Design a protein around this ligand. Structure first.
Ligand SMILES: [Ca+2]
Ligand SMILES: [Ca+2]
Ligand SMILES: [Zn+2]
Ligand SMILES: [Zn+2]
Length: 164
């Protein structure tokens, strides 16, 4: 089924704030903003956590686009392979989600990886959700373009376990 992190990592307050560090030129500013807002929105319904967009570094979740070597000492691999990573809830790097810009970012439709869709799985990690044995889950290691809506019992059971 589903998994959580050692020690059951979670945000210990209910207002979660995200600051978007930068953008890909792949998408217009507005599409990217929307794609992310939607990804929290899927998580918003099922959790006590609310997500407010902020314009400060002090934010709980910081989203950035990086190529190869970037901030956290974890390098991306270029085209394909790794597309994004995230860290379980906590201070600094924890709760933060990074997307590899070498990847083509789109709303999918066979043109690339859906920014919303990659974001949800990273956002799931950001809330403390680990990977799932269930092959239909959002937290599954395998990405496919939507047979969505994205959310699943396994993923939702996973989130209910941690927060509500
Ligand atoms: Ca890559
Ligand atoms: Ca953080
Ligand atoms: Zn990173
Ligand atoms: Zn993952």
């Amino acid at each position: 089924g589903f998994q959580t992190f050692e020690g059951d990592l979670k945000w210990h307050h209910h207002n979660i704030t995200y600051w978007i560090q930068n953008y890909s030129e792949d998408l217009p500013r507005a599409v990217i903003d929307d794609a992310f807002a939607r990804a929290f929105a899927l998580w918003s319904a099922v959790t006590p956590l609310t997500f407010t967009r902020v314009y400060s570094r002090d934010a709980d979740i910081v989203i950035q686009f990086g190529v190869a070597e970037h901030g956290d000492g974890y390098p991306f691999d270029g085209k394909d392979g790794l597309l994004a990573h995230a860290f379980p809830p906590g201070p600094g790097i924890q709760g933060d989600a990074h997307f590899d810009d070498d990847e083509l970012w789109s709303l999918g439709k066979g043109v690339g990886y859906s920014l919303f869709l990659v974001a949800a799985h990273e956002f799931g990690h950001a809330l403390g959700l680990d990977h799932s044995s269930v092959p239909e889950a959002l937290m599954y290691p395998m990405y496919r373009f939507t047979e969505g809506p994205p959310l699943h019992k396994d993923d939702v059971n996973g989130i209910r376990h941690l927060y509500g």
